[PDB]
Design the sequence.
């Protein structure tokens, strides 16, 4: 259980794009109401999960970096 | 088994007002993004359930009101 800085960046980048894409598509889906209403909970879950997993990465990399403070 | 449009109307009324409240709440949350993200799945479920219940009543009331109780 160890990841390098390259793996970290690529992984974070992947997660960032993952969360951002879903978040943007959800914003559009909110306007696509009773059209894509059957898909509401999908993107809602995905956006929540993506950002929760993003946080899961943040909390894990924090302990790794000894990252306990901000800039 | 007897259909009464008035109490059904009150039922629909209560659902309409509820769905309307949930719709604006969801809309607010959608623009209030990277905030309230922890409540995304909750609110989204409400709106979906409300819509699904609106559709439900609409299908149910149509099947019933397409008949006629004599009194």
Sequence:
């Amino acid at each position: 259980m160890s990841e390098g800085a390259e793996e970290l960046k690529a992984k974070l980048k992947k997660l960032n794009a993952q969360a951002t894409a879903l978040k943007m598509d959800l914003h559009d889906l909110a306007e696509d109401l009773p059209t894509g209403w059957n898909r509401i909970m999908e993107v809602a879950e995905k956006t929540y999960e993506a950002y929760r997993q993003l946080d899961e990465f943040r909390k894990s990399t924090a302990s790794l970096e000894h990252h306990h403070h901000h800039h």
Observations:
- The two ends of chain A are 27 Å apart (CA to CA).
- The CA atoms of residues 15 and 54 of chain A lie 6 Å apart.
